[PDB]
Amino acid sequence: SPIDPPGKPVPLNITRHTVTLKWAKPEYTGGFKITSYIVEKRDLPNGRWLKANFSNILENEFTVSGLTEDAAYEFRVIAKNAAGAISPPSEPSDAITCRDDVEA
């Protein structure tokens, strides 16, 4: 009885202070359905993955806020399963400077 984390997160929109990304729902998950889709953000060029979200991401469509301008931020999606286990982090999403939206 193994577990499979959600699909690789891909940002649909990336604001100077709010990066929106969604992913693909799991396909196996042992015998669970997952009841939360957390996501860690990396504050480049000196981050360390930190679950920004804190409002329970039930739907595979969340927005990572609390970011900063002129700073590349990467975002992976970590999520547990109905059993409580913790499905590894979903391959972080491309690091967005989160500034071009205010310049180009």
Curated annotation (Swiss-Prot):
PTM comment text: Autophosphorylated.
Expression by tissue: Isoforms 3, 7 and 8 are expressed in cardiac muscle. Isoform 4 is expressed in vertebrate skeletal muscle. Isoform 6 is expressed in skeletal muscle (at protein level).
Domain (Fibronectin type-III): residue spans on this chain: 5-101
Subcellular localization, as worded in the UniProt entry: Cytoplasm; Nucleus
Family: Belongs to the protein kinase superfamily. CAMK Ser/Thr protein kinase family.
Record comment regarding domains: ZIS1 and ZIS5 regions contain multiple SPXR consensus sites for ERK- and CDK-like protein kinases as well as multiple SP motifs. ZIS1 could adopt a closed conformation which would block the TCAP-binding site. The PEVK region may serve as an entropic spring of a chain of structural folds and may also be an interaction site to other myofilament proteins to form interfilament connectivity in the sarcomere.
Additional observations: In some isoforms, after the PEVK repeat region there is a long PEVK duplicated region. On account of this region, it has been very difficult to sequence the whole protein. The length of this region (ranging from 183 to 2174 residues), may be a key elastic element of titin.
Function description: Key component in the assembly and functioning of vertebrate striated muscles. By providing connections at the level of individual microfilaments, it contributes to the fine balance of forces between the two halves of the sarcomere. The size and extensibility of the cross-links are the main determinants of sarcomere extensibility properties of muscle. In non-muscle cells, seems to play a role in chromosome condensation and chromosome segregation during mitosis. Might link the lamina network to chromatin or nuclear actin, or both during interphase.
Oligomer and partners: Interacts with MYOM1, MYOM2, tropomyosin and myosin. Interacts with actin, primarily via the PEVK domains and with MYPN. Interacts with FHL2, NEB, CRYAB, LMNA/lamin-A and LMNB/lamin-B. Interacts with TCAP/telethonin and/or ANK1 isoform Mu17/ank1.5, via the first two N-terminal immunoglobulin domains. Interacts with TRIM63 and TRIM55, through several domains including immunoglobulin domains 141 and 142. Interacts with ANKRD1, ANKRD2 and ANKRD23, via the region between immunoglobulin domains 77 and 78 and interacts with CAPN3, via immunoglobulin domain 79.
Disease per record: Myopathy, myofibrillar, 9, with early respiratory failure: An autosomal dominant myopathy characterized by adulthood onset of weakness in proximal, distal, axial and respiratory muscles. Pelvic girdle weakness, foot drop and neck weakness are the main symptoms at onset, but ultimately the weakness usually involves the proximal compartment of both upper and lower limbs. Additional features include variable degrees of Achilles tendon contractures, spinal rigidity and muscle hypertrophy. Respiratory involvement often leads to requirement for non-invasive ventilation support. Cardiomyopathy, familial hypertrophic, 9: A hereditary heart disorder characterized by ventricular hypertrophy, which is usually asymmetric and often involves the interventricular septum. The symptoms include dyspnea, syncope, collapse, palpitations, and chest pain. They can be readily provoked by exercise. The disorder has inter- and intrafamilial variability ranging from benign to malignant forms with high risk of cardiac failure and sudden cardiac death.
The name this protein goes by in its record: Titin
Organism, scientific name: Homo sapiens (Human)
Boundaries of the shown chain within the full protein: 22283 to 22385 of 34350
